[PDB]
Amino acid sequence: VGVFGCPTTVANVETVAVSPTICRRGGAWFASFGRERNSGTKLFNISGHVNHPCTVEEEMSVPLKELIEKHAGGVIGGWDNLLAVIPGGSSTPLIPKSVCETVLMDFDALVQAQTGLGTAAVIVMDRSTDIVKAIARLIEFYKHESCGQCTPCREGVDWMNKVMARFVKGDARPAEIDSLWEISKQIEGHTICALGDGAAWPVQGLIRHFRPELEERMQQFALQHQ
Amino acid sequence: ASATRVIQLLRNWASGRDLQAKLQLRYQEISKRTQPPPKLPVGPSHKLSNNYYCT
Ligand code: SF4
Where are the N-acetylalanine modifications (chain B) (predicted)? Predict the structure, then answer.
């Protein structure tokens, strides 16, 4: 079934428009580039806190450092300023500076990096950028974009929005981060579509990757808003 | 309490026991009838994480 109940092949434009080159050259051309399974070429959309944010066709299984150095002149403030990177896209969790170095953007390597290839829409936050604030617009963006049919997504992201609003402000207790963990996994795999799961991965990745920083901001709220 | 010494040594002797040590009625030994506000405790399930009622 599909549109008006008809068979309909939904293919991403990048996969559609690369299909020429694999029919004009063959599978050897596509498979030679990129790692096992993850092969070919994809538009890596370097942006965020990068010196020269642009969209470049790029090989996958590419180290992050030369991804931003060669094609963009580096990350603003260097790697030390770089606190984390969202390499794949929104549905791909961010990973810390101690992990980025030269992780390869091949689907398997993001999986071991607890993230995904997404659409290679890689964006960077510097140290000056608060990671709690960095995804603050991201998580509320997911809430602003949800059809709301299934209960986990309709009641999830908005509830996640409010509980994190007091998180970035710091009006919460240390247990509240654990509750945010619990309901994030609760909506995971329980929504009709992948928007909820797509919204789950960003917040899910942040919790298990910069948890002490999340616990850092809250007593900062407590000392002055006592 | 009220009762003078003369009545006292009569009631101690007739009973043979020191009744003035503790009385069968209270003059001033009770809690003040109104009490300062309390603060009730919490229990094993007033948590937000791994308290799923199923287990
Ligand atoms: S997860 Fe998808 S299907 Fe479910 S409510 Fe959100 S947008 Fe709708």
Answer: 1
